[model samples]
Target: MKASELRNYTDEELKNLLEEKKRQLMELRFQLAMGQLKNTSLIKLTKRDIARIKTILRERELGIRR
Candidate 1:
């Protein structure tokens, strides 16, 4: 998912996206541990995406509309 797309999503949807990404991150780690993951960089990518979602959520908390 891209930050631009996320910016268009509602708060509820963004929350859901966070949960989805959280699970994906865990799965990616497990795969890496088992030597089943070919692209470890995905872990880093997912982490950054999660951070983007959180930043957007925080922006809302402070009434900093995007």
Candidate 2:
């Protein structure tokens, strides 16, 4: 999701999404460790997703204007 799309979600929703993404990242890391992951690109994408969520959440926390 883009920053704009993420901005539409409430804080609670975004927190849930962030948690899910973290879990996914953990699984991907495990796969990579065990040599089961075929595509290494997903790890990068997931990390980016986590970053975007955190950025938007922090912006809201600091009180951004619409």
Candidate 3:
């Protein structure tokens, strides 16, 4: 998801999305440890999305004009 899309979501929605993404990241790590993951790059993409969500969340929290 893009930062602009994330910014469009309400704070509550963003928090929920963040939680879901974290859960997915944890699952991906577990799969990697078990060598069951097929696409390793997916983990990287997920991490990037997590970072995007966080950046938007912090920007909103700090009242930074974006």
Candidate 4:
């Protein structure tokens, strides 16, 4: 998801999304280990999205402007 889109979600929604993404990341890793992952790039993308979500969450928590 885009930063702009993420910014539009409420804090509670973001938190839920963050948790969901983390779960997906864990599943992706398991798939990778089992050689069941068809798209390895998805792992990288998910990691980046998680990081982006975290950065925005932290910024909001600290009252920092993007």
Candidate 5:
């Protein structure tokens, strides 16, 4: 999802989404390790998305308004 799209979600929703993405990244890593992943780029994209979610969460915590 886009950052703009993610920002529309509630805090709890973002938390859940973050958890889901983390799990997906873990699974992608496992697949890569097992040589079963054809599109390795997913790992990079997932990592970026995780970072985006964390950044947004942190911004909210710091009371940084967009």
Candidate 6:
């Protein structure tokens, strides 16, 4: 997911997205360990996306607003 796209989401949606992505990352790692994953780049992408979500959440926590 793109940061621009993520910026459009509300806080609740962003929280849900973060949780869902983390779950997917765990599953993807398992697939990698089992030699079933074809695209390892997905792991990097998911991690970066998680960072984006955390950044947004932190900004909210710090009282930063657009």
The TM-scores, one per candidate, come to 0.57, 0.63, 0.68, 0.67, 0.62, 0.57
Instruction: List ranges where model 1 is wrong by over 4 Å.
Output: 1-4, 58-66
> Residue 26 error for model 5, in Å?
2.4
Cα lDDT tens digits, model 5, 1-57, are: 347766677877976876677678888889889998878787898889877776667
Which number leads on lDDT? 4
On the 0 to 100 scale, the lDDT of residue 22 in model 2 is: 64
Q: What is the lDDT of residue 18 in candidate 4?
A: 63
Clashes of each: 0, 0, 0, 0, 0, 0
lDDT values for all models: 0.74, 0.74, 0.76, 0.77, 0.75, 0.72
Residues 1-66, candidate 3, lDDT per residue (tens digit)? 356677777768977886778678888889989998878789999988867666666777778724
User: What is residue 51's positional error in candidate 6, in angstroms?
Assistant: 1.7
Summarize candidate 4's per-residue lDDT along 1-66 as a digit string, tens digits: 357777777767977886777678888999989998878789999989877777777777877734
Please tell me which model should have the higher TM-score, number 2 or number 6.
Answer: 2
Candidate 3 root-mean-square deviation in Å: 2.7
- Worst 10 contiguous positions by lDDT, candidate 1: 1-10
Q: lDDT score of model 1?
A: 0.74
> lDDT tens digits, residues 1-66, model 6?
246665567877876876677667788888999999779787889878766666666666668635
Q: Summarize candidate 2's per-residue lDDT along 1-66 as a digit string, tens digits.
A: 357667777767876876677678888889989998768787888888867666666667778714
Q: Highest TM-score among the candidates is held by which one? A: 3
Report the poorest 10 consecutive residues by lDDT, candidate 2. 57-66
Worst lDDT window (10 residues) for model 5? 57-66
lDDT of prediction 3: 0.76
Model 4 spans with C-alpha error above 4 angstroms: none
lDDT tens digits, residue span 1-66, model 1: 346676677778877876677677778889999998888677898888766776666666788745
Which ten-residue region of model 3 has the weakest summed lDDT?
A: 1-10
Candidate 4 lDDT at 12 equals 79
